[PDB]
Structure formats: C-alpha cells, structure tokens
Design brief:
Strand order of the largest sheet: 2-1-5-3-4
Family: Belongs to the 2-5A synthase family.
Subunit structure: Specifically interacts with the ligand binding domain of the thyroid receptor (TR). TRIP14 does not require the presence of thyroid hormone for its interaction. Binds MBD1.
Strand content: 25-35%
CATH class: Alpha Beta
Structural class: alpha+beta
Oligomer: monomer
Protein name: 2'-5'-oligoadenylate synthase-like protein
Domain Ubiquitin-like: 8-81
Function: Does not have 2'-5'-OAS activity, but can bind double-stranded RNA. Displays antiviral activity against encephalomyocarditis virus (EMCV) and hepatitis C virus (HCV) via an alternative antiviral pathway independent of RNase L.
Order of helices and strands: EEHEEHE
CATH architecture: Roll
Length: 87
C-alpha cells in the first residue's frame, strides 16, 4: 500500500475487471495521471480515456478545474477503433 498527506488518491477502474489506486496532486494536470497509467499498464494515452460523471477530462484541465476529489472512481475505456497510420 501507499500514502501521502499531500495529494489525492484516485481509483482507476480498468475495462478488464479491477482498479488501482494512483497518486497525483490535485493541482497537477489530468494528462499527468494518464502517463502514470501508460508507464504502469503500458497502454498508450491516446487510447486510455478516463470519463467522469459523463465528461471527458482534457489534458490542459487540472484535476481541480472539474472538481475531482479524493476517494473518487475513474472509468477506463480504450478508444474503440484503430487507424491505418501507426507511429
């Protein structure tokens, strides 16, 4: 387990059947959190899409801009599709 007086703990529910508690500052940018999921899970950000209360969290929108709090849940869904251009 982990802990930290500073920062909020969010649960990332994967489309598989589980959830992982991630650590990220509330002032940080959304993208920041995603990265951690791309380096931990290996899944590409462009794919990983977290939605809250039915809203797409941008990258330039801090975790606060929306109003996210600690002990919150985040749904993960891979972009259903694939382009012929892979870089």
């Amino acid at each position: 387990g982990s802990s930290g007086s500073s920062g909020i703990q969010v649960f990332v529910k994967n489309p598989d059947g589980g959830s992982y508690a991630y650590a990220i500052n509330p002032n940080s940018f959304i993208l920041g959190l995603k990265q951690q999921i791309e380096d931990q899970q290996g899944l590409p950000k462009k794919q990983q899409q977290l939605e809250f209360q039915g809203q797409v969290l941008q990258d330039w929108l801090g975790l606060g801009i929306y109003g996210i709090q600690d002990s919150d849940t985040l749904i993960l869904s891979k972009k259903k599709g694939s382009g012929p251009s892979s870089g």
